[PDB]
Amino acid sequence: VQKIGILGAMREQITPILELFGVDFEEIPLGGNVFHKGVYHNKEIIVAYSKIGKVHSTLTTTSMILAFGVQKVLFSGVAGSLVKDLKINDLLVAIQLVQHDVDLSAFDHPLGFIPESAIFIETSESLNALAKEVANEQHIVLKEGVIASGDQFVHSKERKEFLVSEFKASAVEMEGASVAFVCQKFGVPCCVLRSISDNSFDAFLEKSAQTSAKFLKSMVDEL
Template sequence: MIGIIGAMEEEVSQLIEAMEEKEKVTCAGMDFYCGKLKDKEVVIVQSGIGKVNMALCTQILADRFDVKAVINTGVAGGLYKDIEIGDIVISKDAVQHDVDATVFGYKVGEIPRMDTSYFEADKDLIELAKKTCDEVNPDIHSYVGRVVSGDQFISDNKKKHYLINEFDGYCAEMEGAAMAQAAHLNQIPFIILRAISDKADQEAAGSYEEFEKAAIKHIVRLVLGILDRM
């Protein structure tokens, strides 16, 4: 069983509609749709926005559905200089940029008393996602890089450049690293896929509304392509 998580309805609705033999299981206020997609056994769920929702959702996938891999799909703000709206970031790893225990000698982003704070995506899934994206989305570019997550919508240049300089972030969003941490603790392979809907700057809110649908079209095509090739 493969778990597929999106924070918002629009990030998973097209995938749920394409499922076959699906049934719904509700847990912790989330609807988990189990069935087949591209002849693969999958469970697709809308987690809700933010790190707590995402971590809880991932743990339910581990405990109740015994998933063997997790794909987190959605949109994000672009950070890396060459990334354009509509392009896709495939996670090399993920970190929570809003974790700050520096008063105790930790670096910003480091989670106290954990073995790591930079959670690495599965190398086979990275390779598959990159190859697939180049094939199914030839009209855009895809990049393998770091996803930085926090309970903040990034919409100013000062914070954007901080995330680039401090974390070498390729995109910023609000859930991925929480899924990555939960998957890491449960020893579940994962990948985070993010279509760029804005540039995480002063124009971010307006750009997001305008370009979200186009970004989701690319990410849905990628997820379906990955499942088709697994």
């Protein structure tokens, strides 16, 4: 059978996903997290909220793989734009992700680099081409970019500009890079999608929750 992981970066994204898929979902607790497991079109679907920041999101993804056997992972959520051409409500597919807060510069490593790893983590060529396929069939503009992730909420103009000079990043958030890393380590194809959320707010989040559930279901139908 197929086994597919869907991770949401905000708790409010989860209900809209379960309801769109239509099938019953068993609630299953493991290590502080909650995993929703259902059958749709004869595939196992595992859905969960990541929780906040890199340790939380690493734990959730690691448990999704080792405990539920998911074979592919789809991670939606929200990011802040760092460049003018990226406007509120654009959908961005991450080709590369960087942990922006990593600094081993004292040992002569460049910023973002950990030994036995790399500065930029790649996502799955096949899932990304399918997202472009889904987006075209649905008349959505899907833009391509580098996402930066870290355990700070980045608001200041100075930190934003450093992220663009050093990593060539388009957008910023808190979980993406850790999730894509874990998937690489286990040889599990991953796709990370973000709707742009800044350049009064619940409405933006609600709607973006509804439309991401639709886009993910459409990727699953093709898988």
